[PDB]
Symmetry: C2
Subunit: 129 residues, 2 copies
């Protein structure tokens, strides 16, 4: 059915794990086939599994990415949630840290229908040697 | 104009301050007159300054503080993690929340959505 609050918390936390390990295949599996992704929010939405997989491919690729929850997943009783996390990756050839909040809405099958990632350069920090 | 990323960060941080001190009048001033509020998200949206002010009125022995940086976009929106301290069911309680806000070209809140539920509620048991 439609993910309960606790179920949302588990799903969104799993998402972060798949990202941390770069399991593109599993990430895309979590998405509905008609899902939309806006990342960073304010960019044109990307639609469907093909484009979503392409997005994760170029992002979780050649790069060198880590991600971890920095706080509890906030979950509603209508299949949505939001979570704070931190991403470690290379930005402009330098080791960087990005603070992000993702908002996700799930369908009655527990697949991500909508994901929106909130962050910009103000949330980017370039780490010293 | 439309709030820059840094401006969004400042506005959203100011919102939390007004809440912390319970300045209902100032809170409502931050909102556009036609703004919508969904709090908790998944509840029927509340529309306009009258209803919004009524919402904050009945809601506001409360404390609130940012627990992390405001995430801000380049299109006038942002999201922030924070913690609310209040009485829930006659007991001292803590609530973890994330608010997502979208601003208009006048720097007023057009849309606010508060993400939280009972899973994010913790009660301080009587000691």
């Amino acid at each position: 059915n439609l993910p309960t609050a606790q179920e949302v918390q588990g799903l969104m936390a799993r998402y972060i794990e798949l990202v941390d390990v770069g399991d593109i295949e599993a990430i895309v599996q979590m998405y509905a086939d008609d899902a939309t992704v806006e990342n960073p929010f304010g960019q044109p939405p990307i639609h469907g599994r093909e484009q979503i997989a392409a997005f994760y491919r170029q992002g979780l690729g050649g790069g060198k990415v880590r991600a971890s929850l920095t706080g509890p997943v906030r979950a509603s009783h209508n299949g949505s949630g939001a979570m704070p996390f931190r991403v470690e990756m290379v930005w402009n050839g330098q080791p960087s840290a990005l603070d992000v909040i993702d908002v996700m809405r799930f369908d009655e099958h527990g697949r991500i229908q909508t994901c929106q990632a909130y962050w910009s350069e103000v949330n980017l920090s370039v780490r010293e040697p």
